[PDB]
Each structure stands twice: as structure tokens, then as C-alpha cells.
Design a protein around this ligand. Structure first.
Ligand code: FNT
Ligand code: FE2
Length: 221
């Protein structure tokens, strides 16, 4: 799909109605696999952090750590396909501007590449931007081939506001997900029992970000 067709025929109407939108087979197998290879290279060469401290025990030798991250600009050697993903995300958002709510997106974060190492850790229920920091849309790309949650866990569970039933999303290879970053979309990552990779960028609303600068006295493109 041309980015503009995906944007106009799906992302815009989907976001305005549900605020959570899934695009499968975003970039295709070849490109997805090359992204996977770049992320695994980052992992194998020690570019991720050691992981979120989950359980801090009296003895530090068996401390439990969870999600590992690394921040990627997209131009680094060995990260050019990641950069290409980011550009593709940006192109989609561009074609959506003026149509995602009343927001006006004028920048984004660098990419946060996350690895849940497969040791039964997940991520607690949270809101990405609960305090008005400028971020209006979360965009995440999943890289996990033949991921089977029945077996490997790692489901994203989102709980929209005032709705009784949550939504479970598998972190499937070449899946792109958009959702509003604010309190409309509390979510969590259920425990993962296999290595689980994803890449997130957050898009900023111009007005919210401009006045966040005041109240809190890292944005590109
Ligand atoms: C979408 C979900 N991930 C998150 O909700 C998620 N959210 C935040 Cl705010 C994270 C922050 C630091 C490191 C990993 C994070 C993280 O992973 C997922 O991976 O499916
Ligand atoms: Fe999150």
C-alpha cells in the first residue's frame, strides 16, 4: 500500500473511531527481516541496557531485570533499515496531519528499541503520557517471527477508557500499531517467555509540547 492510501483509507478513520490501529505486513518480509537482523546485531554487540530492575533482592547476583532498551536516531552504521522504518512511520504520519483528532504533529522522539529477554518479565499497566508532556501518538513496530502468545506470552493488553473489554494484541512480525499516548489508553505487556523485540516512536502535538516546555522548566523532525 502507498502510505497515503493506508493513511486515508485506514489509519485516519481507525484512529478517530477507536484510537488503536493495527497495520499488518507493513514493510514486507525482506525489509522486516533486515530490521530484525539490525536489532539482533545491536543486542549481540551489547548496545542495549541490562534491563529494567524488576526485583531488587538482598543479594544482587540474582536481581531480576526486564525490558532492555536502546535509543536509535536511524543514521547509525548498522541501523539504516531502522532509519528506513522511522522514515516510513514519519511518511504515514505526514499523510495523516490535520486529520488525527485536532492535533498538529510537528516532531517525534528518536526510536526506542525494546527487548523483553524472555525471562518471564513484562511491563506493568501504565499510560505512556499521563501528564501532558507533548506526546499524542505512540507508534510501535514488532519484529517477532512466528510469535505464538499461547506459548510465548508477551501480549500487549490495552484497556481503553470507560470500555469494559480490553484488547489483546500479539507482537507479530511486521505489525505496526498506533494508539493515543494519553490516559485514553492504559496498557501493559504480559510476561514474555521468548525474546521479544519492538521499536517505538512517539509523535508530539505542537501545542501540547509548546506549553509542556513551561510546566517542565528530545524532539526531531
Ligand atoms: C507497547 C508495549 N510496550 C510498552 O507499552 C512500553 N511502554 C513504555 Cl512507556 C516503555 C518504556 C520503556 C521501555 C519500554 C516500554 C514499553 O515496552 C509493547 O511492547 O507491546
Ligand atoms: Fe507503553
Amino acid at each position: 500500500l502507498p502510505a497515503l492510501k493506508l493513511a486515508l483509507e485506514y489509519i485516519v478513520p481507525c484512529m478517530n473511531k477507536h484510537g488503536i490501529c493495527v497495520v499488518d505486513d507493513f514493510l514486507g518480509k525482506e525489509t522486516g527481516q533486515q530490521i530484525g537482523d539490525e536489532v539482533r546485531a545491536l543486542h549481540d554487540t551489547g548496545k542495549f541496557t541490562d534491563g529494567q530492575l524488576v526485583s531488587q533482592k538482598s543479594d544482587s547476583s540474582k536481581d531480576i531485570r526486564g525490558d532492555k532498551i536502546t535509543w536509535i536516531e536511524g543514521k547509525e552504521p548498522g541501523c539504516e533499515t531502522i532509519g528506513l522504518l522511522m522514515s516510513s512511520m514519519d511518511d504515514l504520519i505526514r499523510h495523516c496531519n490535520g486529520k488525527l483528532g485536532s492535533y498538529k504533529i510537528n516532531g517525534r522522539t528518536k526510536a526506542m528499541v525494546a527487548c523483553y529477554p524472555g525471562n518471564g518479565t513484562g511491563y506493568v499497566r501504565h499510560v505512556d503520557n499521563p501528564n501532558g508532556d507533548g506526546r499524542c501518538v505512540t507508534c510501535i513496530y514488532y519484529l517477532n517471527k512466528d510469535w505464538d502468545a499461547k506459548v510465548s506470552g508477551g501480549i500487549l493488553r490495552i484497556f481503553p477508557e470507560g470500555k469494559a473489554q480490553f484488547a489483546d494484541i500479539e507482537p507479530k512480525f511486521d505489525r505496526l500499531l498506533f494508539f493515543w499516548s494519553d490516559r485514553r489508553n492504559p496498557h501493559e505487556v504480559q510476561p514474555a517467555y521468548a525474546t521479544r523485540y519492538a521499536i517505538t516512536v512517539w509523535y508530539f502535538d505542537a501545542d501540547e509540547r509548546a506549553r509542556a516546555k513551561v510546566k517542565y522548566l528530545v524532539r526531531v523532525e
